[PDB]
Amino acid sequence: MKYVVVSGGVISGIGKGVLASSTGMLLKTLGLKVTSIKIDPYMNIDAGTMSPLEHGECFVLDDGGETDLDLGNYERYLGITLSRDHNITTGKIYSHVISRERRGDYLGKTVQIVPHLTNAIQDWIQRVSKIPVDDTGLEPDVCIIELGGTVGDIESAPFVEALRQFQFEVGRENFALIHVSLVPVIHGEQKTKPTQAAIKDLRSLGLIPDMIACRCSEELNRSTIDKIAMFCHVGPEQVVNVHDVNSTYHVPLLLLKQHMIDYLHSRLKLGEVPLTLEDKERGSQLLTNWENMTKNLDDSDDVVKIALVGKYTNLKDSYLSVTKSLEHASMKCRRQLEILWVEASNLEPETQEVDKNKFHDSWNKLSSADGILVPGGFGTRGIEGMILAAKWARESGVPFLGVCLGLQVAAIEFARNVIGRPNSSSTEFLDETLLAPEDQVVITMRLGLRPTIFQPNSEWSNIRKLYGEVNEVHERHRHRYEINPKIVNDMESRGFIFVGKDETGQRCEIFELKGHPYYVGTQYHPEYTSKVLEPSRPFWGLVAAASGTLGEVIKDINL
Amino acid sequence: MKYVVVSGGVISGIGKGVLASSTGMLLKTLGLKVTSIKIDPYMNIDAGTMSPLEHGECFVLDDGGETDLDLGNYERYLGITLSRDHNITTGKIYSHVISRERRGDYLGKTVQIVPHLTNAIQDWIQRVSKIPVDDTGLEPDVCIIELGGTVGDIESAPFVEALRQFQFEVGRENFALIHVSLVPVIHGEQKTKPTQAAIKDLRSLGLIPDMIACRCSEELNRSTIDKIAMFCHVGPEQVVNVHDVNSTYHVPLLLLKQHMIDYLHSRLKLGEVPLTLEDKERGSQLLTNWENMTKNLDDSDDVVKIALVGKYTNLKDSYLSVTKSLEHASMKCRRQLEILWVEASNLEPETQEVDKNKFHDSWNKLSSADGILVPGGFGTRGIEGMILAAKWARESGVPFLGVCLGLQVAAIEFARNVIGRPNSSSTEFLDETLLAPEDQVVITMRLGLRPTIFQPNSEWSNIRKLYGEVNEVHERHRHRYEINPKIVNDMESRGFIFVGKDETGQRCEIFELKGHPYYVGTQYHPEYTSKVLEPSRPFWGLVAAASGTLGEVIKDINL
Amino acid sequence: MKYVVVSGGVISGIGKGVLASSTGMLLKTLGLKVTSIKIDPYMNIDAGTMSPLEHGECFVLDDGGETDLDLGNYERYLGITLSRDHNITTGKIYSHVISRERRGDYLGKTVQIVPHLTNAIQDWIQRVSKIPVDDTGLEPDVCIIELGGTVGDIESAPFVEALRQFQFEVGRENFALIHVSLVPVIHGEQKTKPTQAAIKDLRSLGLIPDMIACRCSEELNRSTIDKIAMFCHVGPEQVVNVHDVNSTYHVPLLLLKQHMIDYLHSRLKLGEVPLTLEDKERGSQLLTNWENMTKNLDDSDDVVKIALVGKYTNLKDSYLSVTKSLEHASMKCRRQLEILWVEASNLEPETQEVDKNKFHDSWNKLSSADGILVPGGFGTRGIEGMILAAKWARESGVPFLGVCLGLQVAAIEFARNVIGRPNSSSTEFLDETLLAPEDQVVITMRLGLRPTIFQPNSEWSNIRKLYGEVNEVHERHRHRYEINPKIVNDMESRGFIFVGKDETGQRCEIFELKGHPYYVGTQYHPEYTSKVLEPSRPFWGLVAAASGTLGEVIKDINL
Amino acid sequence: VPGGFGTRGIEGMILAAKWARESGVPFLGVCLGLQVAAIEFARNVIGRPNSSSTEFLDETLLAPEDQVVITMRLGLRPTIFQPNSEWSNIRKLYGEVNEVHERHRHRYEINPKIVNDMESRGFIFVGKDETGQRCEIFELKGHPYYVGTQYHPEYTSKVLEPSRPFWGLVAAASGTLGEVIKDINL
């Protein structure tokens, strides 16, 4: 086993999550079975209690574990599947050892937070890094730990102590620390004193740093690096600069130009880890897929405009997984992406009574879009705008994907505007009216990776061509409310055909509309399973249809 | 070159100076040409300005450099000769670089204390550790640096930075840090939190510790060591305990039982230093001289009482070199020492008018003494008591040594009480009277190691037998005032014979009185040149005469 | 993790089991949490099917796993508790992977013995060496693997391949091979060609040796070692000699004189394993307990004669654990042991009709004994001799221990000879007679470590003093047949008091007879739990009573 | 006998209770102390030498059980004095007030089916729980001061108001137990 801990910061907004998700990617190019752990200093047990307004979207794992965003960034960069244990939190570990007290397992000793709770952290990291994460049950070679918060805090405090002991309870040369740090620029001069005042605290809290990964606004001066290597004890080759480049998928290749694999190969003796040619050649091939997709980003010019239609579009992190899946689908089509933020409530005609500028800008963005996405919203208060965009996408022939709530407004749209029931309703919203035309029903939660089976006649469905025509699809779910299955025999007659269903047959999970270029609902969330070299099939479908050449993508899949 | 820095402390009174003077002694048993450097955070250039009341005696070097006490402890433990450069001070290095500014040598740059002054420290330590110190001009193998003050101060601050750079400007494995530390005991429990709050500051200021040398009141518990080795990163074998033992000459052998040579041989790769058999066998022989003299201390019982007669005897550190030279002379005679502190002014008959108890206790201690010492006092205000003790020592036949002022009160005593001039006077005191019977004259200072030549007829003199009958003696001086040379032809006629003189003949430096068992004045200071295995010949004379067997010591010397 | 594999041999009778049980002991003196694995090339799943005539006694583990003898040697040398998984066998691993085939887990591939079965071995060794074995659930630092059979066989073949891959699937410097070997002596010359013809095969089968542990009849010549170090690639310091010495408890200290800890500390980098002072000081203290008990064996002279009374005494390995527990008890009493082999059937009066010499020699040995043991026999055909020895031990006051069957013949003896039922019988033997005076009943098996609770009045019982007066005893069991609990109220009235019982109260597990110096039955097996520094309390009782000073042992326990 | 925990020292605590009863020395049993006093009195005055702490010797299932489990009972609880109690030195120390409020801990309590025997033999249960079914104080008739309290009297003592059973013990041991009973009741 080996560990690399990514850590530090003068400030908590500094962006450690790319250097974690990008260090682990570079180590995966050596062919190593890499894994990752997030530490979050917040008290939440797991993210399911905190709304998407409050620091971004509610992620989903194979377990159903509603979790921190930063798990998702490692899953999509590293190709790995994570579990709800990979998110260490102050909530979890304190709830764990305090529940263990009432169980009695410390034999009625004191449960001081030094010794015993820092021992539970060091045990949890050693459990979790041995859980398998790739397509086979082989245990990881290297674990990337992202230490949330900063080193020099009061929510960080048990973790930085636990990791001082863990620098020895796992031997040095099986552990390395990467310290992210701030180097401000003021009046044209690079200021390395915030960094030198977090190297003092790092040595004090007891870890010793290996890298000094500065988030400067610039290239670091040769004299700036020379002084950071005088005040921190690292050699000047190790003072990596992580400055902005044309997209975040380039960041691994900047770190590779900055020798970071050659340093980590030495500093963790990675030549002593046992690897097969099936490991190593997969490693060096994955490097060439990353060099190819970044070269394709560097000279892709032909734009594709996708309208993302929903509430809270000013909080873009409320959709981080939706955005990132369109970026994967974009780079695979070799069309450059623009996403058009349509704040759905502005499409509703009553907006014309409040501000006409909003009514025109939103319908302008929607009309300009080469493809349309209803992105699995939350709450109900924007729903009429999401219905109008689904009417537009059906009648104007524009490519369409409905995710989760998106499948459900598509059924509501089709009921109101093709089946001809204008009172038909989201039972998710208009409940205590008790009306008969209910497009949905509550069936109290359903979460995690679940099996979707294709219905028998489905051969013609573009969505089934995009899934490689395989009879079952494994994808991640969230929904309380599902389509009322007593309308399905009507929709099945009117050309709205339910391509895919749950294994009991009673629950509807995919539809495709007959006789449209690409119009799909998926009631699972296709966002979360997308990887940077394997875009999620419904999202690859949307960005292909909107680019043209949907047929040529269907060959690239099925060959 | 190799360095061991002795450092640290929660508190500055903790006693680092033995662990320095005793680490260097253990390394000298490997045969290495060891040297030592004192750092003193005080602003004094050199100790000549600060009176013996204010933190102890005014030392003297071969240069005449009036210096910190702690040079003396290394000289006598290590056998080495030091120079006034071996005392780094905040006074010296700031006076040096600020005088260098007016000379211009920084080419008109800023002389920031980071970079440039910490570079002058790192240059000074590298100059000084290459100065020769043994009986031949061979440069040192290892240098012990004693960092005065504490690590975690404001007078320490440039030194701890300079030594962080010096951990690299000289490579690791040529440098090691020994951190002395406090482990209080309260209500019967050993408290290792003062130590853990100086390991935090040490890592912060940037040095990394190797040893954790606790000054506990006890043996450290196995659980106390195990926790210090959990919070400091040292292994538990390295947490040396430096507790009190029957005399400070045992301390090296406690550190040798605690593996400290075996650790330093590894941690500085001392097997790679080139040594001859003339080095190595001198090393292992010196170890057996230390094992022998400590075994002799362990079962020597026969006491010898020496009266030390002078002012300020409540400030025993005002005489630290005098005390230590009697301890060497004691252990060489194999008699256990008691020193009788005679506060000289109490011997004066006017004390009987003020407090009779003082007059009796002081004359009781003087009468009880097996030998008498006038210890080179300072000022003049106790002089009549020192004259009465010299009258007593001459008439009652008791063994006597006068050092510096001691030779001078012996001439004043002999003038008043044998030559018969009762008005004869210390010109050092009774100056503006302008009287003719002046026993002294001013000749403005005279300092350092100087040559004393024996006068021709001297063959019979016990002091010349103790110096091995060699024609010239090299010893360290301090005196403004010297014997008036126009009385010498009278004293030479009356049996007070000046055994030794300055090379010009005009200055008188040793006398021995004819027809007394042992009665000597030396106007140089014999204290400073004594080593733990080579006691200063006049002091070996005194403690031998007082023990009996002065003749048997004269064979041990001359064989 | 670290591994040392003990292996090799020109011949299979060469005695590898001491070098395994003695290498692991030397590593435990560094304080390392050592464990051990036995590989047995035989096809038996576990030893319960093979009778004690056929290669020695039927061992018992905490699991109830009836197992190979060689587990016992590591348990008693290393203080460890093992589990039935620590005995790898050709039976087990082939039964495992062939049962796994019918379960389907190789996904319908071929299950070649290369790749897949050698992968199951390498998985099993990596599972098993992480199971905890000491008094706390901490996973082992080093694992000793004893490779049964020889390297160069057809029953060895999958293991030597699995261990060639395991030399890499665990890195070199986490693995070392010790090759035991034969160096015959013929016409006075040491013959190192059998050894050189097993170093050829070792290199061929692909492991590389580290040690060459010769079982010569002599000290190896300096020229013999020099040639073995020319033909094997080891340096001559590594060619350890394992010749006979005054008892097998000396063998670790011969290997310690032959540098084997200093070599294994280097060759596995054991300084890089994390140890506490509670580990290290327990390590160096256990070394002094081994130096003390071997020094006590070197000058203990006062004999104690213990009669071991049972069938098959010509097959001494049928009692190996019984013998070894008396040796521990002996060395703890500081009396030298003689065991008197009484072939029990010879005590029966009908032997006088067959051979009087057998009848006299057996009663002579029994009468000569200072103490008597009925050693948990098997079958029934010697039982009348074991009853006569129990009559003798009760009436002649001689110290007595009955183990398992020994407790049961003691109840049968007491019934026939004190309660006065001469027809009372072992229901284990005389079954289909259906008589009413049944001293036993079948209750179909009961195995492994079980809880024995002391009955309330038990305070006076010497056996309860030997167990430290603790209310519950944890010890290993085997019995189909147990004392008929409907006789107990009679025996409890006649002074045969059942000191200890099963937690239900219904089963009787210890008795002590009132008013005899030491007369005990234990229906569990006290042999198996004895360690070389912690002799089994009933056996320490017997060898103490027979030595005299049973009271002084009761202080050594309870202080 | 200071309200111990576990059971492994209990025979020593019984011998000290035998000594304190027969040698007339002043005695206080707190919690477990009341319980070993009942066990002592059963073995050494009532004459059942097999009588036992059911807190220890449980799965023997014997009939002379001096205690029973009744799963926890904690905090400040009301103790009511039994009617005839006027003569009891412990009731004089509580100011003769009919109810006492003090802090409890006990899983195991005296088996209430022995009480009618002890009440006949001069071991009188001065105080009980409000249901009457649980026994909380005893005082032995005809001894200078010999008390069991099954609550813990330690915790309620203040530096200017010492806990009445403990003021009783240190007064009896000092002599002048009567003079303390005036200092209380005046």
Ligand SMILES: Nc1ccn([C@@H]2O[C@H](COP(=O)(O)OP(=O)(O)OP(=O)(O)O)[C@@H](O)[C@H]2O)c(=O)n1
């Ligand atoms: N490989 C990555 C990593 C991060 N991000 C972006 O980074 C964001 C949040 O910043 P991040 O780098 O994850 O760190 P912070 O949120 O600043 O938090 P912290 O510094 O506490 O880790 C999101 O907007 C996400 O789009 C990204 O696009 N690609």
Ligand SMILES: Nc1ccn([C@@H]2O[C@H](COP(=O)(O)OP(=O)(O)OP(=O)(O)O)[C@@H](O)[C@H]2O)c(=O)n1
């Ligand atoms: N740890 C430090 C670093 C610098 N200085 C002193 O502080 C002065 C001003 O600090 P500055 O020159 O700004 O040093 P930087 O570390 O570069 O600060 P910044 O990065 O903000 O420019 C320096 O000339 C130097 O003498 C100091 O006392 N302690």
Ligand SMILES: Nc1ccn([C@@H]2O[C@H](COP(=O)(O)OP(=O)(O)OP(=O)(O)O)[C@@H](O)[C@H]2O)c(=O)n1
């Ligand atoms: N080998 C030694 C070293 C020190 N001392 C004694 O130690 C004294 C002063 O304490 P020291 O150990 O030199 O250190 P501190 O004065 O406490 O100062 P610091 O801790 O700042 O180094 C003197 O009284 C001297 O007699 C001694 O006798 N022998």
Ligand SMILES: Nc1ccn([C@@H]2O[C@H](COP(=O)(O)OP(=O)(O)OP(=O)(O)O)[C@@H](O)[C@H]2O)c(=O)n1
């Ligand atoms: N660096 C540390 C050390 C200890 N503790 C906590 O503080 C409590 C009280 O400290 P203490 O137990 O006294 O630890 P020591 O370091 O031994 O303090 P001392 O040496 O003074 O006894 C401990 O139980 C532990 O939970 C802490 O928060 N931070």
Ligand SMILES: Nc1ccn([C@@H]2O[C@H](COP(=O)(O)OP(=O)(O)OP(=O)(O)O)[C@@H](O)[C@H]2O)c(=O)n1
């Ligand atoms: N520490 C040890 C090890 C072994 N033996 C003795 O060794 C025996 C059997 O030989 P062993 O050394 O265990 O090995 P072998 O039986 O020869 O088998 P192999 O060589 O196949 O391992 C038993 O008689 C046992 O008494 C012993 O007394 N003490």
Ligand SMILES: Nc1ccn([C@@H]2O[C@H](COP(=O)(O)OP(=O)(O)OP(=O)(O)O)[C@@H](O)[C@H]2O)c(=O)n1
């Ligand atoms: N691997 C070897 C070893 C030896 N020889 C030759 O065989 C001769 C006889 O073998 P021997 O001298 O007996 O060598 P040893 O290995 O010592 O045989 P042994 O140990 O049985 O004495 C040697 O002189 C040598 O020339 C050989 O051919 N191949």
Ligand SMILES: [Mg+2]
């Ligand atoms: Mg903030």
Ligand SMILES: [Mg+2]
């Ligand atoms: Mg982040």
Ligand SMILES: [Mg+2]
């Ligand atoms: Mg001070």
Ligand SMILES: [Mg+2]
């Ligand atoms: Mg000092």
Ligand SMILES: [Mg+2]
């Ligand atoms: Mg055979």
Ligand SMILES: [Mg+2]
């Ligand atoms: Mg064997």
